[PDB]
Amino acid sequence: IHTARLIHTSDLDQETRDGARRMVIEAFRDDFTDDDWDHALGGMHALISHHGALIAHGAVVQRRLMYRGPDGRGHALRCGYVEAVAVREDRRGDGLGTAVLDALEQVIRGAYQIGALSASDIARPMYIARGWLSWEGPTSVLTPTEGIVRTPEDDRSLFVLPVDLPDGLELDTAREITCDWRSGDPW
Amino acid sequence: IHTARLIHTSDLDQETRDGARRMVIEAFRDDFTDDFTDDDWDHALGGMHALISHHGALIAHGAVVQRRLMYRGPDGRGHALRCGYVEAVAVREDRRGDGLGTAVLDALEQVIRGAYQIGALSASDIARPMYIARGWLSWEGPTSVLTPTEGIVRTPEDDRSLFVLPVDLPDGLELDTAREITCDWRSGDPW
Ligand SMILES: CC(C)(COP(=O)(O)OP(=O)(O)OC[C@H]1O[C@@H](n2cnc3c(N)ncnc32)[C@H](O)[C@@H]1OP(=O)(O)O)[C@@H](O)C(=O)NCCC(=O)NCCS
Ligand SMILES: CC(C)(COP(=O)(O)OP(=O)(O)OC[C@H]1O[C@@H](n2cnc3c(N)ncnc32)[C@H](O)[C@@H]1OP(=O)(O)O)[C@@H](O)C(=O)NCCC(=O)NCCS
Ligand SMILES: CC(C)(COP(=O)(O)OP(=O)(O)OC[C@H]1O[C@@H](n2cnc3c(N)ncnc32)[C@H](O)[C@@H]1OP(=O)(O)O)[C@@H](O)C(=O)NCCC(=O)NCCS
Numbered sequence: 001i002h003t004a005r006l007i008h009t010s011d012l013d014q015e016t017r018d019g020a021r022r023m024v025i026e027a028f029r030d031d032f033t034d035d036d037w038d039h040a041l042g043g044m045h046a047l048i049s050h051h052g053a054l055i056a057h058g059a060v061v062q063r064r065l066m067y068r069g070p071d072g073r074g075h076a077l078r079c080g081y082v083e084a085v086a087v088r089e090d091r092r093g094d095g096l097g098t099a100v101l102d103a104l105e106q107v108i109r110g111a112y113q114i115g116a117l118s119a120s121d122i123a124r125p126m127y128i129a130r131g132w133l134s135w136e137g138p139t140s141v142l143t144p145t146e147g148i149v150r151t152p153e154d155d156r157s158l159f160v161l162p163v164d165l166p167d168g169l170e171l172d173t174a175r176e177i178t179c180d181w182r183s184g185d186p187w
Numbered sequence: 188i189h190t191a192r193l194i195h196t197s198d199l200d201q202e203t204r205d206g207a208r209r210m211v212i213e214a215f216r217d218d219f220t221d222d223f224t225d226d227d228w229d230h231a232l233g234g235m236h237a238l239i240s241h242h243g244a245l246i247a248h249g250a251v252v253q254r255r256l257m258y259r260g261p262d263g264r265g266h267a268l269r270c271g272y273v274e275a276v277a278v279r280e281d282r283r284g285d286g287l288g289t290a291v292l293d294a295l296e297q298v299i300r301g302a303y304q305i306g307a308l309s310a311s312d313i314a315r316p317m318y319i320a321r322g323w324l325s326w327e328g329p330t331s332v333l334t335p336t337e338g339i340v341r342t343p344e345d346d347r348s349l350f351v352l353p354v355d356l357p358d359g360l361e362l363d364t365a366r367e368i369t370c371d372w373r374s375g376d377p378w
């Protein structure tokens with residue numbers, strides 16, 4: 001069985017960051033943009049290498065997810081957001097994806113109030129099987145110039161993993177949920 | 188001689204985390220209202236901690252957490268910068284003045300330079316000369332916060348407290364510190 005190493009972005013040399021980026025881009029090839037890479041930087045990376053070649057990657061970066069309960073109170077949850085999860089093609093189906101998520105979920109459970117991610121279609125059963133909840137209500141992003149704006153192309157994609165919500169808060173996945181602002185894909 | 192260890196929030200046991208919080212709360216003491224509040228501790232969670240311990244006792248702490256800083260340049264183009272935000276920098280009172288806080292900020296600035304486009308913090312009044320000497324820039328224009336119900340809302344209590352450390356600004360961006368700057372939303376003190 002393989003085990004992922006967990007490394008902060010700042011503990012990654014440029015050679016190893018460039019190798020990770022190139023492995024991720026190839027893994028997403030039919031798609032992975034310059035903004036997509038920026039989104040994967042700043043947090044903890046899960047890495048698996050074999051003889052100096054990276055064969056699996058994932059990242060969890062901190063952001064705020066905003067949720068307003070029925071009673072009208074607002075919540076700005078410390079969110080561990082999962083990005084750039086990828087296994088080299090020739091090494092897929094061997095549990096390397098599971099090893100990446102095991103290490104990232106340890107980060108989420110140890111440090112954040114909620115995990116969240118916008119899953120590709122292929123990865124959906126994988127996350128469902130691990131206990132991630134599909135979000136059923138509308139999604140949105142908090143923009144700097146127009147307030148909260150709907151993001152309908154992301155409604156089907158969003159999964160959350162509530163690990164340490166504030167005392168008495170219970171997420172209703174049919175309500176709206178809002179992510180903080182960034183360039184490119186908000187979710 | 189003094190070197191802090193870097194550890195992510197998720198690698199601290201609850202007892203070390205709780206000790207860190209108690210130590211930082213006391214460091215911020217000069218009645219029953221703690222100057223360093225529960226929300227203040229939450230803002231230190233989720234990133235990299237710099238720790239210094241001496242025969243088991245935690246004698247220094249600092250953290251850098253990821254946020255977005257929003258800045259609109261003089262050309263009208265908006266930027267959502269990946270920001271390493273510095274929180275809860277503290278040295279046990281009896282050990283101050285020996286380079287421990289310098290050692291904490293050394294480690295945190297390494298995180299910022301290696302991971303983020305910009306470092307930022309909201310400095311206590313008395314700590315401002317220290318940050319200037321380390322090459323942080325004082326922000327001179329108005330500060331604000333992007334709220335989910337109101338618009339961008341001015342935060343005048345934090346004007347003149349903000350410092351930034353621009354380590355990897357995109358392509359041609361050059362910060363003009365007289366313009367407005369805006370932080371993302373969180374509970375408690377936004378800056
Ligand atoms: C997504 C990706 C990382 C999965 O990697 P992988 O090596 O195929 O995955 P694994 O072999 O580790 O399988 C992961 C888990 O999903 C499970 N699984 C896969 N398909 C499943 C299905 N239809 N139903 C139930 N479980 C399923 C496996 O059983 C495994 O769980 P297990 O370890 O308990 O058995 C890989 O396909 C990839 O890199 N794709 C390209 C990039 C991409 O699209 N990334 C997803 C963005 S979130
Ligand atoms: C502010 C603090 C972290 C500085 O740590 P320190 O270990 O005492 O300071 P250092 O010895 O590393 O010196 C760093 C700089 O701090 C300044 N400073 C602040 N308090 C100082 C003190 N008691 N003794 C010496 N320098 C002090 C000096 O300008 C010094 O610069 P220098 O070495 O070039 O002379 C620490 O005194 C403390 O915990 N105070 C409580 C308040 C606080 O931390 N504010 C939050 C940061 S915004
Ligand atoms: C730290 C600095 C002063 C050089 O280091 P240094 O002068 O050798 O300082 P040290 O590391 O030896 O500090 C230890 C000494 O601090 C003194 N000291 C400072 N605070 C003390 C305290 N609270 N208790 C006891 N001694 C203290 C003591 O004399 C101690 O020596 P001793 O106990 O052995 O007698 C350095 O940061 C510097 O030169 N600062 C430049 C200023 C700057 O950055 N400004 C730029 C303007 S933009």
Ligand SMILES: NC[C@@H]1O[C@H](O[C@H]2[C@@H](O)[C@H](O[C@@H]3[C@@H](O)[C@H](N)C[C@H](N)[C@H]3O[C@H]3O[C@H](CN)[C@@H](O)[C@H](O)[C@H]3N)O[C@@H]2CO)[C@H](N)[C@@H](O)[C@@H]1O
Pocket residue numbers: 028029030031032033036037039082083084085117118119120121122153154157185187
């Ligand atoms: N875009 C068209 C389709 O893209 C697919 O790839 C999938 C994937 O990239 C993408 O997945 C989702 C989208 O769902 C969702 N609307 C936004 C979200 N940020 C994105 O996210 C995913 O891909 C990004 C790269 N982008 C990565 O940066 C990100 O970490 C990853 N989780 O959408 C696709 C499936 O939903 C295939 N290439 C092909 O089946 C088809 O062409």
Ligand SMILES: NC[C@@H]1O[C@H](O[C@H]2[C@@H](O)[C@H](O[C@@H]3[C@@H](O)[C@H](N)C[C@H](N)[C@H]3O[C@H]3O[C@H](CN)[C@@H](O)[C@H](O)[C@H]3N)O[C@@H]2CO)[C@H](N)[C@@H](O)[C@@H]1O
Pocket residue numbers: 214215216217222223224227228273274275276308309310311312313344345348376378
């Ligand atoms: N009065 C002198 C000193 O005051 C300190 O209090 C200062 C401190 O709380 C606070 O400092 C600044 C403010 O400026 C600024 N407008 C907002 C910013 N979030 C805050 O931040 C600072 O204190 C917080 C705890 N709150 C920490 O969580 C935070 O990491 C720290 N950088 O404002 C106070 C005055 O600057 C301490 N009580 C003690 O170190 C000493 O007594």
